Design a protein around this ligand. Sequence first.
Ligand SMILES: Cc1cn([C@H]2C[C@H](O)[C@@H](COP(=O)(O)OP(=O)(O)OP(=O)(O)O)O2)c(=O)[nH]c1=O
Ligand SMILES: [Mg+2]
Ligand SMILES: [Zn+2]
Ligand SMILES: [Zn+2]
Ligand SMILES: [Zn+2]
Ligand SMILES: [Zn+2]
Length: 1107
Amino acid sequence: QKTIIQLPNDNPACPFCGDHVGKPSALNVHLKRNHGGREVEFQCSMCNKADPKAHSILCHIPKCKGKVTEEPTGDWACETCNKQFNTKSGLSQHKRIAHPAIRNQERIAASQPKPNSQRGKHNSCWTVEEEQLLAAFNNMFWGKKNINILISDHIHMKTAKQISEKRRLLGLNKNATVTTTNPLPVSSTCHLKIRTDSPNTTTGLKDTYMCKINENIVNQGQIKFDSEVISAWMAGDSNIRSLVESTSLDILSTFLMETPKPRKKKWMEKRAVKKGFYKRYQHLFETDRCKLASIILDGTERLQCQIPLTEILETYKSKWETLTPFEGLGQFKSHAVADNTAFEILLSAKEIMKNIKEMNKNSAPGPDKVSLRDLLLADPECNALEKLFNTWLITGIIPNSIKECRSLLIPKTADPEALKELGNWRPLTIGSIVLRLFSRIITNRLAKACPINARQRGFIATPGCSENLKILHTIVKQAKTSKKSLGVVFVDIAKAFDSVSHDHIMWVLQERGLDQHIVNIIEDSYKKIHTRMEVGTERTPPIEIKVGVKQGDPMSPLLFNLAIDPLITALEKANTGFSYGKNKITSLAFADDLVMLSDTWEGMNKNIQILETFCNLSGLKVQAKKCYGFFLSPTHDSYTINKCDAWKIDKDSLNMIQPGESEKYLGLKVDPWIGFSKPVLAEKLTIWLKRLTEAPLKPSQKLTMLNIYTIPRIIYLADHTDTKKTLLSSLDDNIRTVVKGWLHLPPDTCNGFIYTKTRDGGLGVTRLASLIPSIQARRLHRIATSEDETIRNIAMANNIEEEFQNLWVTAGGKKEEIPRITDPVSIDYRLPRRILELLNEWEKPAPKKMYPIPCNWREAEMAHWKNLPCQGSGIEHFDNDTISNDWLQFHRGFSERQFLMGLKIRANVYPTREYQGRGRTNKNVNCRNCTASYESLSHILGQCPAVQGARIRRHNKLCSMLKREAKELKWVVYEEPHLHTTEKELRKPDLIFVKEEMALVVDVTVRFEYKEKVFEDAAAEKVRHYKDLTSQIKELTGAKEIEYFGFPLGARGKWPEINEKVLTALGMPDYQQKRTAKRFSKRTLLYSIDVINTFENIGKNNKNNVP
DNA sequence: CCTTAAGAGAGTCATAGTTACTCCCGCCGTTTACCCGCG
DNA sequence: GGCATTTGGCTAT
RNA sequence: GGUGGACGGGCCACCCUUAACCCGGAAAAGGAACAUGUGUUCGGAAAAUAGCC
DNA sequence: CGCGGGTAAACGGCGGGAGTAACTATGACTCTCTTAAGGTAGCCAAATGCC
Ligand SMILES: Cc1cn([C@H]2C[C@H](O)[C@@H](COP(=O)(O)OP(=O)(O)OP(=O)(O)O)O2)c(=O)[nH]c1=O
Ligand SMILES: [Mg+2]
Ligand SMILES: [Zn+2]
Ligand SMILES: [Zn+2]
Ligand SMILES: [Zn+2]
Ligand SMILES: [Zn+2]
């Protein structure tokens, strides 16, 4: 098993090779060095406490107190895990926390009264057999002449008065005939068809279009359209379809560019495999690295459907081409009438450009082989696109030559065994990008035209999952707290987009009110769509999409939401929801995943009835295998869970959730016992960091991948689950240790360096303990100020003002700064007010609500870093500097060793003698190859004579570089010209530049960053140094003007702006000045690294080569 | 060719907050089970 | 005319 | 003590042919699958609606 | 049989005091410190929208 090394041990011997390598830290290093892959653990010898990390046990030993393992003896023992407690309440608490199901069963048992004694001592000597016989006889003797006869005497030893008594127990006047149970048919939502004629005026949009086009023709307006086609359309042309098809074909042929041809630019040794892997990863790093992040983090390269193409063709022919019966939704109504005014204002090129800018730039093309890039290249002003889309909109036609689309299969499950079956493959359908853009524009217009029920949080402007998750959690929490019964059900529509019949969407776009013109446009957009599916290298014959909505067309989400809206509206109208105060919420929704809420079990029965009726009518099917639910009946002291019977969705037992069980919801793990199951963030984080560690992903690339691709995945779950600061801090320690291992930074490296952003000089590593609270506060503010009055009321009533205040304080905000959660939130539009008011609302970029941040925690990290006397000296120089910190983010030309050494230098944690002896009193910190008292980076790079040569070399090289720049800008250069002042001294200026008349005297110095004035003082020194050479300089060059600005350069890469003034005096343009400044910074840092390497070799390597 | 100084985080255990309940006490209100008048 | 302005990820479905 | 295991720290194998390896500041196919020893591939594969950082 | 009206005691439903297991959050302290090579060139971070 896992080998164990026990401490305290001054010089433990490794369990695998038995080498006395040193202290337990050195032993751990050696174990990771020569014994990787083999598990080791460290143990507390006096206490048998195990931990993989040696330092944990090392710090524990002093705190340890003998043999600390005695169990907490107590006469109340837990049945399952056998823990002992000294009080019944304590044992019940343990069973509650650890065994939620057992505690729930105990709660229900306590609730079940079962005293068999709730009478009141008034029970008599009546016999059950006599009771039953009297029951039968009076059923026989119902107020019919001679009504006692038998009753009086047949019951021997009784009186008719006793008969009256027992009847008064059961039946009062008579006996008790037992007849109970509720009625089944209580929905009645399948009648009263309403469709009579066109919802809106049949020419409601056609009349407006004719008026607008007449105005455009008369006044020669800017509305664009082919004259002949709209002229024929006005004239009632019979063959408008062919003519518009021809005009389309022409414009598309203009768009159907000859798209640029691809311009993308023993003997058995396993070395090849390794090389290949490295090559692959590095290539994916150089090219798109979202795929690299997916491959590494997820571990799945890419999953393709191995199912035979014949089977796929058969299934999708029987699915897409096969129709289903439709009859209308009956009483199911959808919110309210549709607003046709949204379809006024014909499409303008500005609107098309706005929509394109909001699309995905890198979208794969359809069968047209036309991408967004090509669309913009052909029509950068979108005038041709405006003409085409206006023609289609006015004529209500969409050419069939563009309907052709290509399909594909996507793995919707991560388990390859599940992927074996075809049911776990999602069919995507990608049409011509022109069609995608037109459908997106019509989708925006429709979304404004048809208002969806507010409870539908999917595919709308509100933040969806955040609102639904918070509302569900708060609903359950309030039900637990206020002793109100709650019943929750989670329902998913099967084949949401592939099972929605075109006739159903048409019906929804009927009496809703949508203009018949737009209804015709929609029907056309899903008429004669051919989607020949392609798998691997083989493509199926054409398949005619006659059922469902293309999974990938921009209008499909909106059409599905419109199709579902009657269901959500009916559920809301049923008023069976959770009675949250005066109002009551009935169903949260997100696309197809909808959760129904109720106040009683029978209320959820009614909701299930409504859902079943809707699924029967619309044709959508709800599978009971992915539907969950639970009930929260309350007790005196607490709540029971699932005390009632299971639900009967579609005549099948709904999968109820027991305490401790967790069924996922919007990526969460809703658990009836504790709301959301606490996510496994430590486990996922450890897995991801291990995957990154063991990849051909050189430390800098590892850090880039971590920062840019790993953290967000955990960010979502960490923020949406209330995640406390302690767990986030533990995750932060894990990430910090792993990152330091990647970059070989010593464990004691300042946290500020790790957490300050790359632009600020740090590594740009996210601090979860300081970011997740900020995101949480912002999310609470967003939910508080949501557009849904229901969500507002629900959340406000749960006193989330205090929660938001606590999160604001926790994130680092100030009590005073706390915004009033009810105050309006500033909205920005990324355009000037004049420009905004210059255009209509269809061309207006979507407004973005700006929510305040509790504090710039990165600024706090930088402030902490500066306060450190040793690991933050002179680090204010790199603050908010975009030049000196460029290399941290663009380090091509830095060898990985060079980049890591630069990180160490910048963080002031380079292992020098001063750093090695830092803190300890009994550890020499003198200079190893010199007599300086302290072996710091400043001395090593600026004072030690040992590296004198290297230092000179660095200076000289930098001078040469500047000279080269001056040569490029056509300046005559004099290098190190001897000059003796009036005092007959030796003053050499590094560079003398001559052009036209004026001459420039530039001296280059490289100074370590310690204090702000340092560079200023260097420049002054040079200014205070040459001066007196004025006359001499003239005689050397004949110049008429001379200047004496110096050229200081940061030893660690700082670029003072006085150097920018030097360059401006040189006449360099601003952008080239920025390029030169970045190049300098990087090259100065590289030469300082060279000096450090020369120092390291001096002495050490001298002794090694020469003992 | 240029500088003075020199912990800092990792880590555990102790103790207090606090979450979401559990236990018990006791009182007031509801239920149960006959009684009486009774046409 | 450069200038300037911006380039990235993730989650849900 | 010398070589081999791409290179370095090990650790192994041979005494030149080379079975397996761990870690790395090193590592851009002597692999896998086609095409008959020599070429290719060894996909950037994947769409949409919203939100969040 | 049906018709009401009275009935009054466990017990259960609830207000509230008293605990409490086990997280969660700081506070008070201690422990940690030599991983592994040598050279050379030092570059890639640009592309793109508007102007
Ligand atoms: C996951 C996903 C969903 N969607 C859309 C299309 C779906 O119809 C809709 C809901 O998705 P799902 O409900 O996750 O898919 P489904 O219900 O059709 O699968 P199943 O029958 O097994 O339950 O969201 C996408 O467009 N792209 C995606 O990647
Ligand atoms: Mg579904
Ligand atoms: Zn060992
Ligand atoms: Zn111990
Ligand atoms: Zn237990
Ligand atoms: Zn020295």
